[PDB]
Design a protein around this ligand. Structure first.
Ligand code: HEM
Ligand code: HEM
Ligand SMILES: CC(C)(C)OC(=O)N[C@H](CS[C@H](Cc1ccccc1)C(=O)NCCc1cccnc1)Cc1cccc2ccccc12
Ligand SMILES: CC(C)(C)OC(=O)N[C@H](CS[C@H](Cc1ccccc1)C(=O)NCCc1cccnc1)Cc1cccc2ccccc12
Lengths: 449, 449
């Protein structure tokens, strides 16, 4: 509790830090609730402490642009030191400074419009393996848990688009490439990571990691089997200033988690809103059958054509942005937009609280997809709606994620309807924990068309 | 490297400790090899350091009796502080002083001759489920890996004799009660545990454990489902100064590992010796069919009748005693048998090196079961052959283990023969690591009678 006078000094407001803790007991209602309050209590800029670590929470559009886009290279290049990581030190979302810039380049031409359109026929082959697994349960009038069957698709899409491994993971729940894959910032351990960051080095010297030393060393070799037995990996092996062999292994892993629990979790958020807003599900099912008659197979070009679908995805991401907040470590005593920012301070943009501020959203907690209509889609600040971040360090797999999810919805809405159950949690309650996820796993009724 | 002058002082010999390490780089050939050398180099008593931790290695029969049996309660009550353990602090093999003595009593009447004879009909039902899984592979002339099919029996015997859960684990490799269950003192981590014991408290304050916080909390509830849905557990619930609820959970866990990888690992050691000594396998198969004609089902009383079988088990345990060494923490500055022992020192008996000393064994590395014949079985010091330890803190499940393994061998040898393969590692090479286990998994040919 030494350097705790920083925010009283600069005349910057915020709640008072206790010695050695900071404002971490304020996380008992999860990040979002503490954010909503602090934006309401203190206004445009506030500060707090994550232990001995100061965090400055900005909410101004032009200030966010300078941090995410303008002075990204100069001042705000990296994210908060996350550890202990072992050999995942080299993963792009963890990597820092000139290793990020060297990895963000060797890995960018993997998500182009040419490579993304070339996965459309392959992501297609799996959207149908979903329908067979849905109709067997649809015929059996027994409520469906989305994240189970949804994640099985995202996992199936990942494995294929990355290494070619084709598994019907749903019916195949007991595969060496399935168990490993399926395996929280407010649990006992990460509370202590945020408060004993001095203990982080104690564990990087023990080969101890937040990723178990087994899954990695299973996929470490599985790749170097694939590497030497011959999608994202075919695009990465051809890329290796070249990629070290343990370095390429670490980039594969982050892709999987990225697309496995985000694609799965977001589709579960989309289906809840369609079922609890039956008129929206009706309008969508109509546009889908306009572009795609006779339950036609969707294409890359036709997916981008569907604009009520894009509206539906964005309003859901507004309500449930799995980022919650975006963060960067400032590296220089640089005053931006008239506010002196000292070195070492973490800058934090509160996405969730921003997406729910009545100052920029009329009826903010209601689900109104027409905010994003090509009529009203211009009154929207690109730096207030930040579901993939912004700028040089924004989400590297945005195009894939958006296309991945829409190819699922189209294939699903052509065939099924989704009704609320009794055990459906209406209105849904989020997590008191540290990620964007539901309290109860999402449960719905599913009827065939 | 402060208190390192202890052994130069007392005039007690041993290898020289480097500062802050001790003699731990001598473990590059595993515990056994360092033990064999030190017994040969220094004689009857030597010392060394496991970090800042002194260890005194005794090899005298009357001195071992005082440590394991006589002054067990007074001086040498506990084993070396093992951590980090979380809630397994209460497990009996970890527990210390008056909690051990309170737990060793509440749990002793679980292994009596009356309770052990009452599992004979239930362990019987599984010895046959092994034969069906062996004959399907026997018919398919494809070499067999013992620890796989053997562990599936020991696991099946454990689950039944403890909670009644009946699973054909072999054909059922993908069960929530099977995956959890199947999941080293010289790897990166425990090297650092032995050298940074000051870091052990740093991890007991993080709920971090050598047992993952998932398997436990799966069986923590699985038991309290069984506890409230209604073998070792039926004998333990009836027992609860009574057993706390998380305390009884911890005792169940240690029973499982105890009997899963010891029963399995020892049967693999027994079958290797029978196959590589075909005449012994022939004599045994003959005695078995004398007590049990027409491939008769073995019984409690008939198992104890078979004395060449007991000889075969003991000689194997001599060659491969999974204990390797027995250890106790001295708690008092007590001079025993004429040698001043300071408080805090760990006393260590080297089982493996003792079992292989030519001073007590003619042809020590050869496999001669007739050492233990009722003719020669008296020239054997009970404190030199210590496969279950000795005295108040000896193996609590010795009777079960010995009976468990013999019920397997009898059911197996009645039906199959075991021949060495080409890929059979002859003569077997042990582990350069820290446990009793083979270099290559054990591979043999199996023919039906
Ligand atoms: C619904 C889907 C997704 C959403 C909403 C999302 C959102 C985000 C956000 C907010 C960031 C941080 C951007 C910033 O700090 O400003 C990020 C980073 C990242 N995402 Fe995504 N993401 C999604 C899916 C994916 C997928 C499918 C991949 C597949 C590879 C992926 C790969 C990455 C990577 C590598 C980063 C780190 C980029 C860097 O640090 O340079 N993401 N994502
Ligand atoms: C081949 C089979 C086994 C062998 C060779 C073996 C050997 C040993 C040895 C050497 C000890 C330490 C004794 C000492 O420190 O002097 C021990 C302890 C123990 N064994 Fe076994 N064991 C076997 C199987 C089992 C089984 C099947 C169980 C089932 C419950 C079991 C339960 C225990 C327990 C609870 C302890 C700790 C006792 C205490 O600390 O008071 N063991 N075993
Ligand atoms: C700042 C603080 C200490 C509070 O927390 C972080 O430092 N944690 C991450 C840095 S490592 C993160 C951890 C990870 C890695 C593999 C498997 C599971 C978890 C990571 O690599 N996830 C990449 C995949 C992904 C995740 C989400 C969207 N798309 C892609 C900061 C961070 C990194 C990348 C994307 C992020 C998106 C939203 C919020 C934070 C993000
Ligand atoms: C002294 C030193 C620091 C080098 O190492 C130990 O402190 N480690 C054990 C103390 S905890 C042990 C660990 C464990 C617990 C659950 C699952 C896996 C591992 C334990 O509870 N295993 C009980 C089961 C068992 C194991 C073997 C034979 N039968 C029963 C010292 C110890 C305890 C009990 C039996 C032992 C037998 C031989 C050698 C050491 C023994």
């Amino acid at each position: 509790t030494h350097s705790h006078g920083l925010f009283k000094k600069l005349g910057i407001p915020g709640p008072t830090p206790l010695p050695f803790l900071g404002n971490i007991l304020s996380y008992h209602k999860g990040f979002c609730m503490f954010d909503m309050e602090c934006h309401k209590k203190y206004g445009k800029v506030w500060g707090f402490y994550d232990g001995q670590q100061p965090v400055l929470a900005i909410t101004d559009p032009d200030m966010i642009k300078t941090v995410l886009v303008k002075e990204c290279y100069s001042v705000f290049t990296n994210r908060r030191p996350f550890g202990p990581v072992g050999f995942m030190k080299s993963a792009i979302s963890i990597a820092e400074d000139e290793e990020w810039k060297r990895l963000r380049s060797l890995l960018s031409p993997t998500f182009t419009s040419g490579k993304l359109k070339e996965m459309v026929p392959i992501i297609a082959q799996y959207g149908d393996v979903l329908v067979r697994n849905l109709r067997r349960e649809a015929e059996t009038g027994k409520p469906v848990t989305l994240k189970d069957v949804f994640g099985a698709y995202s996992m199936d899409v990942i494995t294929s688009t990355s290494f070619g491994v084709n598994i019907d993971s749903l019916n195949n729940p007991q595969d060496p490439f399935v168990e490993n894959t399926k395996k929280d910032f407010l649990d006992p351990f990460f509370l202590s990571i945020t408060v004993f960051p001095f203990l982080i080095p104690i564990l990087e010297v023990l080969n101890i990691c937040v990723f178990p030393r087994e899954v990695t060393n299973f996929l470490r070799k599985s790749v170097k089997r694939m590497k030497e037995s011959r999608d994202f990996l075919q695009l990465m092996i051809d890329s290796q200033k070249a990629l070290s062999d343990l370095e390429l292994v670490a980039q594969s892993i982050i892709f999987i988690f990225a697309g496995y629990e985000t694609t799965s979790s977001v589709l579960s958020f989309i289906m809840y809103e369609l079922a609890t807003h039956p008129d929206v599900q009706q309008k969508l099912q109509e546009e889908i059958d306009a572009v795609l008659p006779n339950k036609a197979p969707p294409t890359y070009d036709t997916v981008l054509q569907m604009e009520y679908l894009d509206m539906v995805v964005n309003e859901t991401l507004r309500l449930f942005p799995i980022a919650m907040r975006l963060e960067r470590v400032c590296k220089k005593d640089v005053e931006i937009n008239g506010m002196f920012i000292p070195k070492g301070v973490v800058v934090m943009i509160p996405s969730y609280a921003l997406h729910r501020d009545p100052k920029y959203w009329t009826e903010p907690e209601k689900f109104l997809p027409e905010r994003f209509s090509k009529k009203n889609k211009d009154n929207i600040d690109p730096y207030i709606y930040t579901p993939f971040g912004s700028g040089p360090r924004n989400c590297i797999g945005m195009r894939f994620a958006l296309m991945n999810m829409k190819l699922a919805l189209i294939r699903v809405l052509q065939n099924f309807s989704f009704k609320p159950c009794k055990e459906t949690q209406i209105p849904l309650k989020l997590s008191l924990g540290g990620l964007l996820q539901p309290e109860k796993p999402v449960v719905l009724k599913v009827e065939s068309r």
